[PDB]
Paper text:
Bacillus cereus (Bc) encodes three FNR paralogs, two of which have assigned distinct biological functions in bacillithiol disulfide reduction and flavodoxin (Fld) reduction. In this study, we have assigned a function to FNR1, in which the His residue is replaced by a conserved Val, in the reduction of the heme-degrading monooxygenase IsdG, ultimately facilitating the release of iron in an important iron acquisition pathway. The Bc IsdG structure was solved, and IsdG-FNR1 interactions were proposed through protein–protein docking. Mutational studies and bioinformatics analyses confirmed the importance of the conserved FAD-stacking residues on the respective reaction rates, proposing a division of FNRs into four functionally unique sequence similarity clusters likely related to the nature of this residue.
To investigate if the interchange of Val to His in FNR1 and His to Val in FNR2 could explain the differences in the efficiencies of Fld or IsdG reduction, we generated cross-mutants of the two proteins, FNR1V329H and FNR2H326V. For the FNR2H326V mutant, the λmax peak is shifted to a lower wavelength, while for FNR1V329H, it is shifted to a higher wavelength. In the case of FNR1V329H, replacing Val with His did not lead to an increase in the turnover number in the reduction of NrdI; on the contrary, we observed a kcat value 4-fold lower than for FNR1 and 55-fold lower than for FNR2. For Fld2, the turnover number using FNR1V329H as a reductase was shown to be 2-fold lower than with FNR1 and 480-fold lower than with FNR2. Although FNR1 has been previously shown to be a poorer reductase of Flds and NrdI than FNR2, these findings suggest that replacing the FAD-stacking Val residue for His in FNR1-type FNRs alone is not enough to make FNR1 a more efficient Fld reductase, somewhat distorting the fine-tuned chemical environment in the vicinity of the FAD cofactor. Comparing FNR1V329H to FNR1 as an IruO reveals that the FAD-stacking Val residue is a key structural feature important for the reduction of IsdG and breakdown of heme, as an approximately 2-fold slower rate of heme breakdown is observed using FNR1V329H as a reductase as compared to the wild-type enzyme. To investigate whether the altered reduction rates observed for the FNR2H326V and FNR1V329H mutants could be explained by their crystal structures, both structures were solved. The FNR1V329H structure is, with the exception of the mutation, highly similar to the wild-type FNR1 structure with an RMSD value of 0.2 Å. The mutation has not led to a change in the orientation of the NAD(P)H-binding domain relative to the FAD-binding domain, nor a movement of the other residues in the vicinity of the FAD cofactor. The lowered activity observed for FNR1V329H must therefore, from a structural perspective, be directly caused by the chemical properties of the single Val to His mutation, strengthening the importance of this residue for the biological function of FNR1.
Author numbering:
A (entry chain B), B (entry chain A): 4 to 349
The structure:
């Protein structure tokens, strides 16, 4: 059949390294991700420097996502993006059937749940036809600090990530505006006092009411603002717009599944130090995995993934070795290394 | 006193990441390594490509040692190189005294044992004054493939690690010689048959009996060979000499200690999923740590190290958080990020 050895639900660090290590151990591997892009929660902070991945000199999240996606695809898994896994069923023969929000079905000998803290969607701007500018200069994350160098940015919404974004764009942007719909910027008073003594201009009881494209482009050239307590309707020229109205979560995967998988605190999968859940051949890796030695770092996701994959290989092939062969000596990389070495000699 | 918070014994991946994460959590950190150079077992294979470190695109061991050492020194720990720790003593107050082969003493609130598989020294060539040529062209490891491009190398010894080197130098070197003192090349018949089908010339019952330097330099220009069954004494011009007569191990650290530490299989530290040993404030990380979920990868060294450090911080400061703050938002990196961002904006 179309029966995979290992199917990975989720495309963040845990899922990607599962796909990678599953390929290192020569299993037919699939990875299913909700978003149209792989990478996981790091898409929430692609502009920050990341210092605590073992062996990485500091990189931005954006560059880290690049490296992880490349590593996850080394063995060319079946990649199913734009797909919400809706439920997991354990068949009587012991294999698994994954049902997507479409009803489409996937089949696997083992499943590695790497859904992290779930499906995150940024809450969209409820302005008529605002999606036109998503392809240009209407953002829901700070994709990179350089993107905003010398530009004029307005941030809609307060608190959440808003105060933190403004504080890191203040020394980079030409000007930073913040518009909040309440009275006080809903952060913690530690970082809101630096925001107000510095080069950020705040508008309270205001919201964006129309995105005005250029007569020459389709980028946002001006923005219309509206006061909720006085009533004034002003216009403002900007180079970039960033929306921060929060995130929507979807964690329904395991509730919607008929599986006696043990769950901690109504969300996390109750696992052991080897990433095993209470259902045979169903493993958890990454933020979804909870056990007494779970390390709440990206570095821990790699360990969960490797432990999960190593268990899956022996579930499928009992006489398989219990540990994967070190990459430095694994012939699985012979041809790939061949070209890399040929470039190393100039 | 000179009482450190965390002292790390061993400077490989586990030790290096312990020092880093110990610095991330703002503890006075020391790291002690036997060799003149940090890096650990990766120095045994600095010429190989490493694919399975989470988030690293394939890089050589040489480059990985570079990256790990830089990360391990991020917070400028006290680095004691060229130093063998001989024993660990638990003081009455619960702190620790580490005694070096000199008798010098180090003091710590916690110890993180990251000694891997022990102190490794390559078995030296027992030829009079052969160490003169170590600084020139007599090597005991393949430091890099490019070093040997288009060169003529003689490799002494015929063990399984001898055969592996020749097979990766065959398509790079101009010519490869292999000399073994026994009758049959004591590898496994899988790669020993590949050795003989190519441009590698083997000499059996042979060993080097004198190294002949250049009259103009002091590198080895010719090498003297001797047949152990015929008796011939031939001479051979070579560019590089590589000795592979095996390694000497030193694992006496935990036998020499009067410490009630639980040891598995007469070597490993018997730990839990949080890198705790049976002695309070004494942690183990990396290849020395054994427990049911230990991952035998560099990737696992990072998890062991992080879990150990997080436990040490709470051993030293009970009210400290049990998880270290994520690097992407940790003010401890403010000044360093300041400089990096200034370079990122051109
Ligand atoms: C703001 C912030 C900063 C951080 N900074 C650091 C740092 O500096 N260093 C560090 O080590 N860690 C950091 N972390 C932690 C790090 O983000 C997590 O450890 C890591 O992202 C967890 O990886 P994961 O793959 O387990 O989960 P995730 O990264 O959340 O990946 C889950 C993926 O699976 C998808 N998914 C979920 N449910 C489904 C479904 N039903 N069907 C299909 N796909 C689904 C999601 O869309 C997502 O793409 C930070 C976290 C946050 C929130
Ligand atoms: C040939 C080979 C290839 C490998 N390839 C891979 C690969 O591709 N991927 C992968 O993930 N893993 C690989 N590994 C495994 C990897 O090398 C180990 O997982 C890793 O080195 C463990 O790190 P460590 O810091 O725990 O131990 P080590 O690397 O052994 O570090 C221990 C350090 O402590 C020092 N030390 C020991 N005793 C003392 C003492 N008493 N006083 C002071 N210092 C002391 C030692 O000199 C050494 O520097 C490979 C291993 C080998 C042997």
């Amino acid at each position: 059949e179309e029966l995979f050895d290992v199917t990975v639900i989720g495309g963040g660090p845990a899922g990607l390294y599962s796909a990678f290590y599953s390929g290192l151990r020569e299993m037919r591997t699939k990875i299913i991700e909700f978003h149209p892009h792989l990478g996981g929660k790091i898409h929430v902070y692609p502009e920050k420097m990341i210092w605590d991945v073992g062996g990485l000199l500091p990189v931005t999240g954006d560059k880290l996502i690049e490296q992880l996606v490349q590593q996850g695809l080394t063995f060319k898994p079946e990649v199913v993006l734009d797909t919400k896994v809706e439920s997991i069923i354990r068949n009587q023969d012991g294999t698994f059937t994954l049902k997507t929000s479409t009803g489409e079905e996937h089949f696997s000998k083992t499943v590695i749940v790497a859904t992290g803290s779930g499906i995150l969607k940024p809450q969209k701007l409820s302005i008529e036809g605002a999606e036109r500018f998503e392809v240009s200069n209407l953002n829901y994350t700070v994709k990179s600090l350089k993107r905003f160098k010398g530009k004029t940015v307005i941030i809609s919404g307060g608190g959440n990530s808003a105060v933190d974004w403004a504080n890191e764009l203040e020394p980079i942007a030409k000007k930073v505006y913040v518009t909040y719909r309440k009275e006080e910027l809903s952060g913690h008073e530690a970082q809101v006092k630096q925001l107000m003594n510095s080069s950020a201009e705040c508008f309270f009881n205001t919201s964006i009411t129309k995105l005005i494209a250029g007569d020459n482009h389709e980028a946002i050239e001006y923005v219309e603002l509206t006061n909720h307590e006085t009533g004034e309707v002003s216009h403002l020229p900007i180079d970039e717009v960033i929306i921060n109205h929060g995130y929507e979560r979807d964690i329904t995967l395991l509730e919607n599944s008929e599986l006696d998988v043990a769950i901690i605190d109504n969300y996390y999968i109750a696992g052991n130090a080897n990433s095993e859940s209470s259902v045979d051949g169903l493993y958890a890796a990454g933020d979804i995995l909870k056990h007494e030695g779970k390390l709440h770092l990206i570095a821990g996701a790699f360990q969960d993934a490797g432990n999960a994959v190593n268990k899956a290989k022996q579930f499928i092939q009992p006489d398989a070795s219990e540990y994967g062969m070190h990459s430095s000596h694994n012939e699985v990389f012979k041809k790939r290394n061949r070209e890399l070495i040929k470039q190393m000699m100039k």
